[PDB]
Structure formats: C-alpha cells, structure tokens
Amino acid sequence: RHTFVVADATLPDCPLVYASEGFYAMTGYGPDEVLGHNCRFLQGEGTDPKEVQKIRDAIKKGEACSVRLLNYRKDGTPFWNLLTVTPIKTPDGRVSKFVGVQVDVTS
Ligand SMILES: *[C@@]12=NC3=[C]C([C])=C([C])[C]=C3N([C][C]([O])[C]([O])[C]([O])[C]OP([O])([O])=O)C1=NC(=O)[N]C2=O
C-alpha cells in the first residue's frame, strides 16, 4: 500500500497541489486542510529533526531523498511514514514539482 502527493516547487515553500485518495484517508485530513499547505503539518514532537533535515536539504539541492518519519494523524495518533521525494524537472534543468510516495510502515 502507498499514497501519493504533489508539491509545487515554483512556490518557495513547496505547497501540496494534489493528493491521492489514500492520503486523505491515511492521515485523516481533507483537501480543504491539505491543498495550499506544506506537507509538514503531519509532523509532531516525535519526528526526528535529523531526518527532517535530510528532506529539507534534498529539496533545496533539488535531488531525491528517502526517509523514515514519525507522522501524526488528525486525531493525534502516530504512524510511521516511509517517505520518498523525487524532483520533477523541466528541460532547462529547473525543478517544477516535487512528488511524494508515502507508505505507512507501522506494520
Ligand atoms: C510529507 N510528504 C512530503 C511530500 C513531498 C512531495 C514533499 C516535497 C515533502 C513532503 N514532506 C516534507 C515537508 O514538506 C518538508 O519538506 C519537511 O518538513 C522539511 O522541511 P521543513 O521546512 O519542515 O524543515 C513530508 N513530511 C512529512 O512529515 N510527511 C509527509 O508525508
């Protein structure tokens, strides 16, 4: 199982512009509270700041990244998210969108 989202790299904070049907179902949020916002709303006090830093750098460098984060649902309950980010580039070498595949690997 996996979910899928899209971020807009032309905007400075990479706001999500499209989320799959499982993303809203897995996390507990709805489009009205997801679109236009950075994905970071899923994090909490248990999220490893070293792992978050890896995604922050790969987004600035415009390269791919894969991390294991402790994300939280809308009801505060935790789940473990195997996140993979991939830069989508235009022909001129510039990054237009970031794409994310989230897998709930809490087992
Ligand atoms: C999040 N998924 C997700 C999907 C995409 C396509 C991108 C680009 C990022 C994420 N994040 C990370 C978040 O947007 C942000 O980049 C990081 O928090 C690091 O930057 P900051 O400014 O916060 O230091 C995802 N983060 C999650 O926790 N869960 C995901 O599903």
UniProtKB/Swiss-Prot annotation:
Q: Which residues form the PAS domain?
A: 1-62
Mind telling me how this protein is modified after translation?
A: Autophosphorylated in response to blue light irradiation. 2 molecules of FMN bind covalently to cysteines after exposure to blue light and are reversed in the dark.
What is the tissue localization of expression for this protein? Expressed in gametes, pre-gametes and gametes generated by pre-gametes (at protein level).
Residue ranges constituting the PAC domain according to the UniProt record? 63-107
UniProt-reported outcome of changing C39A: No effect on blue light-induced kinase activity
Please give the residue positions where the record annotates the modification S-4a-FMN cysteine: C39
Binding positions for FMN? N38, C39, R40, F41, L42, Q43, R56, N71, N81, Q102
Its localization reads: Membrane
Task: Describe the family membership recorded for this protein in Swiss-Prot or TrEMBL.
Answer: Belongs to the protein kinase superfamily. AGC Ser/Thr protein kinase family.
Per the entry, what this protein does is:
Protein kinase that acts as a blue light photoreceptor. Required for non-photochemical quenching (NPQ), a mechanism that converts and dissipates the harmful excess absorbed light energy into heat and protect the photosynthetic apparatus from photo-oxidative damage. Controls the energy-dependent chlorophyll fluorescence quenching (qE) activity of chlorophyll excited states by inducing the expression of the qE effector protein LHCSR3 in high light intensities.
Q: What is this protein called?
A: Phototropin
Which species is this UniProt entry from? Chlamydomonas reinhardtii (Chlamydomonas smithii)
Q: In the record, what lineage is assigned to the organism producing the protein?
A: Eukaryota, Viridiplantae, Chlorophyta, core chlorophytes, Chlorophyceae
Q: Which residues of the full protein are shown?
A: 19 to 125 of 749
